[PDB]
Every structure is written in structure tokens, then in C-alpha cells.
From a paper:
Rubella virus is an enveloped, positive-stranded RNA virus with virions ranging from 500 Å to 900 Å in diameter. The structural components of rubella virus are comprised of three proteins, glycoproteins E1 (58kDa), E2 (42–47kDa), and the capsid protein (31kDa). In this report, we have used a combination of cryo-electron tomography, sub-tomogram averaging and in vitro assembly studies to elucidate the three-dimensional structure and assembly of rubella virions. Instead, the structure of rubella virus, as shown here, has an irregular helical organization of its surface glycoproteins and a pseudo-tetrameric inner nucleocapsid arrangement.
The rubella glycoproteins (E1 and E2) are present as heterodimeric complexes or spikes on the surface of the virus. The averaged glycoprotein spike structure consists of a broad base below a narrower stalk and has an estimated resolution of 11.0 Å (at 0.143 FSC cut-off) and 14.9 Å (at 0.5 FSC cut-off). The top (external) part of the averaged glycoprotein spike has weaker density compared to its base, indicating that there is more variability in the region distal from the membrane. However, all fits resulted in similar orientations with the long direction of the known E1 structure roughly perpendicular to the viral membrane. Thus, the residual volume at the base of the averaged rubella glycoprotein spike would be sufficient to accommodate the ectodomain of E2 glycoprotein. Along glycoprotein rows, adjacent spikes were slightly rotated with respect to each other, along an axis perpendicular to the plane of the membrane. This analysis showed that along unbroken glycoprotein rows in rubella virions, the glycoprotein complexes are similarly oriented with respect to each other, such that E2 would most likely be located between adjacent E1 positions. The relative positions of the rubella glycoproteins, with an extended E1 conformation and with E2 at the base of the spike complex, is different from the glycoprotein heterodimer conformation observed in alphaviruses. The common antibody binding region on E1 (between residues 202 to 285) is exposed to the surrounding environment in the spike density, given the orientation of E1 as determined by the fitting results. In the rubella glycoprotein complex, the E1 protein extends out from the virion surface and does not appear to require E2 for shielding its two fusion loops. The observed variability in the glycoprotein spikes suggest that the tips of the E1 structures are flexible, which would help E1 to avoid non-productive membrane interactions at neutral pH.
Author numbering: 1 to 209, 214 to 421
Write the structure that this text describes.
């Protein structure tokens, strides 16, 4: 009979007439675009207030004052910046330690004491933090900052394009997976056409390491999801950085009573302030850093509030159109395709070229590692298909499979091509 009924999209939803249709589940199909690794831009800073004029401005050379683990970690960070300021130099003796060796840029000091850091005079700054010197007060300040990639904050991200909500149905015990692309089901003596809502558009898959969390959109870096790691540090191969990068941090020596401290540092700015020591010939350092994007990202907290456990789908219901019509059975070729060549990339967003020869006896319903790439009449075929699976490629027309020739690169290799 020609019939109509609405089927809800929740677990337990089922209709009984004219033929029972049960909502078995909800899943999704897509064309994956693997972006690799993403992380927030984490400005990390360290340093030391030193009551001496050190001759080796490095983590090892400053080991007696600079915290060990933060120095080593920040030194290996992205867009490293470091400055060594001479507040009060040697009045006599020493080795390239007099005030004259601290010209702007510190080239005279660097000639005898090489360093990857900037060297600057700071003679008009307060030297009060360094006390207990009977004849010659000596004081220097070291600051080190970079964008450190924290492993606990790094997320693997897969963009989902051409998203198709899969409404898994059971029509009188027979499995039927309906989408906007394939909305028809066979019923005991007719055909069921399922009216489905539109697809949800692009999805963002945040891979926690293994758990997947879901975002709906591109994402939108201009809205509430602005702090997404996707909007920040991008590493396609989870090793090398690409695209947009902040400038090297701007380090400043700021005295405790400087009016500048009444304001907050800007993004990427690092202000260091010497703290008067409780011990003779020793001092502390107070560091004020302006994080990128005006805030520090707390990854488990961001993920929990800005993502869902499952991909989003519209509320429904589904329109079940029951028809007495039966589809015209076309002859299908079951023999595997011949001389199949696959060229390009997979999970990259650029359709790969699939070419070969479809065999006789009907249309070849071509699959590339189980992925449907369309049906082709017998003879030579050429198609541009978005592939989700890596090589080797098993090609079939619905029956037996054959190994295709492939020149296909991974998403990370595509990003560097």
C-alpha cells in the first residue's frame, strides 16, 4: 500500500505499519582531511637575577642561577628569545666584564663570551637586589622565553567534509543505511523512500591520546571556539611547524617601581623584575608574561566544554514514504576491474585520480578498499575520488578483489608537497 509515517531519531524509536521500521542507530560518513597535530601557543618564560657577570650565557653556563628543567625546555621551544642585561658590571679586573664591554648589542662582551642570546647594557636600572659586596657590586639579569609545545595540550585533528548522517534502519529485520545520497530501502513487496533532514555540514574531530571529541563547523576561530588548538599551532607531521607563527617574545627588564607595571604586558611580551634577596650576593626574579590570544588554554577544560562525545545530527523525524514500486534490476559485473591505477593522496581533501578498465557483463560498482567511488560501464574509466584509506588499494566491482597500482602519499606528505 501507498503509506506515510514519521519515524523519530532516538534509541527505541520504531513504527509498525505498513511494514515495521526500527531506528537501529545513528552514525556518519565523511571525506576525512587529516590536519595532523594542533596545540595552543604557550608562551613560557624563565630566567634569573644574578649577582655576578657570567661568562657563559647558556643553560649550562647559568646552571648556578637559572632553573635547570625550565631553561632546557624553553631553550628547545619555538621562536626562542633570550636577553642578558648587565645592571652593574666589574669596576676593575675580570675578563671582558667591565661596563665598556656592554655596548648596545653587547658585541664587545660577545667577542670573548659568545652566546645565542642578546646582550644589553642596563646600567641605569636598580641594583638594590644585589647586596653584601664590600667594594664592587656586580649584577646581571637573564630572561628566556619561547612558545613551548606541551604534549598534554597537543591534539590530533581530523576535519570531516562532505558529512552524511547515516540513519541505520531495520526494515522488517533487513538492514538499510539511509543518507541524503542513498535514501531508498527495499520492503517485502515494494520500496521505501526515506525523507531525511539536511546533513550537518563540516565536523571537527579532536583526537585525545584514544578518545575522539566532536566539534560542529570549520571551526569558527572568530566565535566562542576562538581558543581551539586548530586556530593556533599547526604541525601536519607532528614534528614541523607550518603557517601563522607569533613573533619572537619581546623581553624587557622592568624595575619594581617602574610605572609600566601599572599596565599588563601585551601578547608575547615578557617583563622581568629583580626581587631583593634575603641572602647576600643573591636575588630572585618576578616574571610577567602576556599570553598569545590574551589567555592560557587549559586543554581538558576546553575540550570538555567546547566538544561533544558524539557528532551532532538534526532532531528529525524521518519521513517514511512507502511505495508499491520495485526498482528495475540492472545487470551487474562481478569480475574485478583491470589495470587500476590510483594517484594523489588520501585523507587530504584533494580527490585522487582512479583509472582502469571495467570488465564486461554490466556496470562495475567500483570500490577502493570498500569505499564506493561510483559505477562505471564496461571499458576504460577515469574518476576523481576522495579517499579515506591508505595504500595498498584492493579494487572490486562487487565480487572478487584485485591489487591496484598506487602512487598515493599520506596527509602529512601532502601538506609538505
Amino acid at each position: 500500500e501507498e503509506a506515510f509515517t514519521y519515524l523519530c531519531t532516538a534509541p527505541g524509536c520504531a513504527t509498525q505499519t505498513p511494514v515495521p521500521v526500527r531506528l537501529a542507530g545513528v552514525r556518519f560518513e565523511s571525506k576525512i582531511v587529516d590536519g595532523g597535530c594542533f596545540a595552543p601557543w604557550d608562551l613560557e618564560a624563565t630566567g634569573a637575577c644574578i649577582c655576578e657577570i657570567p661568562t657563559d650565557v647558556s643553560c649550562e653556563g647559568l646552571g648556578a642561577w637559572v632553573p635547570t628543567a625550565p631553561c632546557a625546555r624553553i631553550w628547545n621551544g619555538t621562536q626562542r628569545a633570550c636577553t642578558f642585561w648587565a645592571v652593574n658590571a666589574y669596576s676593575s679586573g675580570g675578563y671582558a666584564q667591565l661596563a665598556s664591554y656592554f655596548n648596545p648589542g653587547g658585541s664587545y662582551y660577545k667577542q670573548y663570551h659568545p652566546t645565542a642570546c642578546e646582550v644589553e647594557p642596563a646600567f641605569g636600572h636598580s641594583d638594590a637586589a644585589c647586596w653584601g659586596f664590600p667594594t664592587d657590586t656586580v649584577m646581571s639579569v637573564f630572561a628566556l622565553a619561547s612558545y613551548v609545545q606541551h604534549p598534554h595540550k597537543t591534539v590530533r585533528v581530523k576535519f570531516h567534509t562532505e558529512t552524511r548522517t547515516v540513519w541505520q534502519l531495520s526494515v522488517a529485520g533487513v538492514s538499510c543505511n539511509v543518507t541524503t545520497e542513498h535514501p531508498f530501502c527495499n520492503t517485502p513487496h515494494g520500496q521505501l523512500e526515506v525523507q531525511v533532514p539536511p546533513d550537518p555540514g563540516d565536523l571537527v574531530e579532536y583526537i585525545m591520546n584514544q578518545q575522539s571529541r566532536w566539534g560542529l563547523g570549520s571551526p569558527n576561530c572568530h566565535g566562542p571556539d576562538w581558543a581551539s588548538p586548530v586556530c593556533q599551532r599547526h604541525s601536519p607531521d607532528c614534528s614541523r611547524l607550518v603557517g601563522a607563527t607569533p613573533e619572537r617574545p619581546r623581553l624587557r627588564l622592568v624595575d619594581a617601581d617602574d610605572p609600566l607595571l601599572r599596565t599588563a604586558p601585551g601578547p608575547g611580551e615578557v617583563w622581568v623584575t629583580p626581587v631583593i634577596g634575603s641572602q647576600a650576593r643573591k636575588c630572585g626574579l618576578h616574571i610577567r608574561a602576556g599570553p598569545y590570544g590574551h589567555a592560557t588554554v587549559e586543554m581538558p577544560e576546553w575540550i570538555h566544554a567546547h566538544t561533544t562525545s558524539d557528532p551532532w545530527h538534526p532532531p528529525g523525524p524521518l519521513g517514511l514514504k512507502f511505495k508499491t514500486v520495485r526498482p528495475v534490476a540492472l545487470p551487474r559485473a562481478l569480475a574485478p576491474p583491470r589495470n587500476v591505477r590510483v594517484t594523489g593522496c588520501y585523507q587530504c581533501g584533494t580527490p585522487a585520480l582512479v583509472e582502469g578498465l571495467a570488465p564486461g557483463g554490466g556496470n562495475c560498482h567500483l570500490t577502493v578498499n570498500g569505499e564506493d567511488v561510483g559505477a562505471f560501464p564496461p571499458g576504460k574509466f577515469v574518476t576523481a575520488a576522495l579517499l579515506n584509506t591508505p595504500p595498498p588499494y584492493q579494487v572490486s566491482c562487487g565480487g572478487e578483489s584485485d591489487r591496484a597500482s598506487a602512487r598515493v602519499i599520506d596527509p602529512a606528505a601532502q601538506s609538505f608537497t
